[PDB]
Design a binder for these strands. Structure first.
Ligand SMILES: [Zn+2]
Length: 462
RNA sequence: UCCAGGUCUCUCGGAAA
RNA sequence: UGUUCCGAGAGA
RNA sequence: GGAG
């Protein structure tokens, strides 16, 4: 992914967009109860704590495109992956406007509490002005689909979120591409049925974990896996992707019945963006906020691994590789050991930058003890060791409860966090609850006891 | 002075029944 | 327990 | 930037 040009919105008639310039993240009741080092991300460039140039930094992700052509290993990957997906009897029919808009089995509705993107955002129009869930009316949407059509520019925003000190300094804030309501809707008519398939079928056939509940899914995963596991991290995954990859994805899509609508895939490859007072063209790179981006980035991952395999281990039978991706996150297994430091080398030739998993500063052996998926470890229940806890480290939970975007959320916020923390076990969780309750708000809350969570976790299993 | 900040998935919560 | 609308948190 |  790489910018082709950038110039001031007003030069070509596009409006300026003003994002709010101040974060909603205040310090929380529990700010000093817990220790933590993440702070709000950098939103503007007239900002003190910046240690280097802002814009220069947020855009450095678009490093370059590297390949242009699908090679034979990519074609092989494609073939193997495509034939995997045909096993699922996936409805290849367009989804009707009503189901696209308002949901159906396997796909939730458009979010009524989010921007409608271009151009509605430059006319103070909202989704609630067009969509209505209680009548599921389509008329005004079809009318707007006639009017503006599709393939509209995306609006760029900075994600307002907690961030590492290092990254606030280096200005490594994260970018959001606001999808047009129109484009979101066209995408769901074309691929709603594929989404509903993947959402229903997380595992090793899809290689996606989208649609899973970690509390119930962590128990199915080691069954689905092979023996020796491998994993790694990606640097700038989505931006790092390049045209050949989007081409290979189209080939999979052609192969499983969605051929008449692969041009839509071109519209994620070649994209135009509104960012504040500027306007830019990007070729290569998955955009952050498009419809499907979660499904599509996983598919492309299931293609990258398979490819790098085929390149790095001649004659390798991918018929025996077991993997699950959630976008760039991945947990992968082969019956025989595979060396991530090798794949990471091949990776370069495909424009991908692969580093060792979980920030561990050298390539060593993945094992159920140190492996991670969606920021969770795997840890078997002491009583029933076939039930696997998803375990997120307190450290992460600690950072979260220190800040808030609205204090009247505090009960829910903290409740949520408990639901996560207790997998660390009764000793850590009762102590969590102690620290919480050491402040007058803490004691005001209704928090569940360790007994209740365990009892409910087990009962959820049948 | 209010509003503004994507795609999805899971879960919790509040309502209404 | 089954849905419906809304809120929130987390993950990618 | 978007309504008063
Ligand atoms: Zn262009």
């Amino acid at each position: 992914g790489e910018i082709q040009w950038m110039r001031p919105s007003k030069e070509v008639g596009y409006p300026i967009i003003n994002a709010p310039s101040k974060t909603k993240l205040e310090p929380s009741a529990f700010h000093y109860v817990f220790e933590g080092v993440k702070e709000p991300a950098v939103l503007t460039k007239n900002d003190p704590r910046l240690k280097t140039d802002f814009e220069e930094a947020i855009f450095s992700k678009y490093v370059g495109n590297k390949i242009t052509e699908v090679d034979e290993y990519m074609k092989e990957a494609v073939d193997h992956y495509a034939g995997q997906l045909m096993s699922l009897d996936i409805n290849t029919e367009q989804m009707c406007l009503e189901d696209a808009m308002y949901g159906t089995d396997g796909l939730e509705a458009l979010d009524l509490s989010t921007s409608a993107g271009y151009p509605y955002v430059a006319m103070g129009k909202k989704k609630r002005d067009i969509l209505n869930k209680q009548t599921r009316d389509t008329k005004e949407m079809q009318k707007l689909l006639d009017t503006y059509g599709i393939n509209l520019p995306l609006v760029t925003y900075v994600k307002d979120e907690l961030r590492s000190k290092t990254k606030v300094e280096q200005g490594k804030s994260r970018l959001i591409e606001a999808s047009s309501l129109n484009d979101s809707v066209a995408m769901r008519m074309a691929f709603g049925n594929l989404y509903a398939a993947f959402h229903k079928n997380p595992g090793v056939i899809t290689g996606s974990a989208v649609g899973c509940d970690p509390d119930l899914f962590w128990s199915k995963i080691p069954v689905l896996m092979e023996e020796k596991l491998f994993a790694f991290d990606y640097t700038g995954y989505d931006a790092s992707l390049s045209p050949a990859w989007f081409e290979a994805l189209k080939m999979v899509l052609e192969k499983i019945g969605f051929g008449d609508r692969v041009d839509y895939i071109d519209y994620l490859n070649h994209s135009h963006h509104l960012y504040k007072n500027k306007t830019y063209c990007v070729k290569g790179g998955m955009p952050s906020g498009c419809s499907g981006t979660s499904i599509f980035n996983s598919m492309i991952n299931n293609l990258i691994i398979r490819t790098l395999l085929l390149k790095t281990y001649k004659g390798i039978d991918l018929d025996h590789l077991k993997m699950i991706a959630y976008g760039d996150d991945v947990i992968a297994s082969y019956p025989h050991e595979v060396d991530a430091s090798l794949l990471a080398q091949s990776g370069k030739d495909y424009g991908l930058t692969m580093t060792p998993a979980d920030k561990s500063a050298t390539f060593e052996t993945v094992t159920w003890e140190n492996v991670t998926f969606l920021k969770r470890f795997f840890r078997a229940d002491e009583k029933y060791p076939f039930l696997i806890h998803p375990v997120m480290p307190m450290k992460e939970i600690h950072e979260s409860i220190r800040w808030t975007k609205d204090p009247r959320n505090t009960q829910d916020h903290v409740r949520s966090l408990c639901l996560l923390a207790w997998h660390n076990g009764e000793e850590e969780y009762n102590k969590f609850l102690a620290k919480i309750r050491s402040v007058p708000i803490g004691r005001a809350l209704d928090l569940p006891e360790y007994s209740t969570l365990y009892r409910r976790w087990l009962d959820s299993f049948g």
